[PDB]
Amino acid sequence: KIQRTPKIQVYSRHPAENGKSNFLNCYVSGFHPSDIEVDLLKNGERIEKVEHSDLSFSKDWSFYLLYYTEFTPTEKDEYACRVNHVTLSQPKIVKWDRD
């Protein structure tokens, strides 16, 4: 069986305004099998209070999950989504980009 690697899309719920509480979303999709590990990161470090959806899959049987948490964007702070999957030899990191 051919395994599918995760697509990773990072986006804020609201336009980023420095110092205004917001929501950071990481959508992980297109992958197979379903076993996966997803963290949201702040300046490389793991964020502890992160929520996520129950497992689902698309019409082509690829799995997808939403991870999200509250955050307050600043100018200097960096946020990212780090994913591990059997298809990846090392964790894949996708940083959030307001522009």
Residue ranges in contact with other proteins by CB under 8 A: 1-4, 9, 11, 13-15, 23, 25, 27, 32-35, 51, 53-57, 61-63, 66, 68, 98-99
Q: Does 78 bind Cl ion (CB under 5 A)?
A: yes
Identity of the residue, 25 or 84, whose beta carbon is nearer to other proteins in the bound complex: 25
Q: Give the interface segment with Cl ion, choosing from 12-20, 23-31, 53-61, 70-78 (CB under 5 A).
A: 70-78
Q: Which residues pair with 84 in a beta bridge?
A: 37
Distance of alpha carbon 56 from alpha carbon 15, whole angstroms = 27
Q: What x-and-dash track marks residues 32-51 binding Cl ion by CB under 5 A?
A: ---------x--x-------
End-to-end Cα spacing for the chain: 38
Distance of alpha carbon 32 from alpha carbon 13, whole angstroms = 27
DSSP-derived 3-state class of residue 71: strand
Q: How far lies 76's CA from each of 19, 72, 81, in Å? A: 11, 12, 17
Identity of the residue, 88 or 93, whose beta carbon is nearer to Cl ion in the bound complex: 93
Q: Which residues contact Cl ion (rule: CB under 5 A)?
A: 41, 44, 78, 80
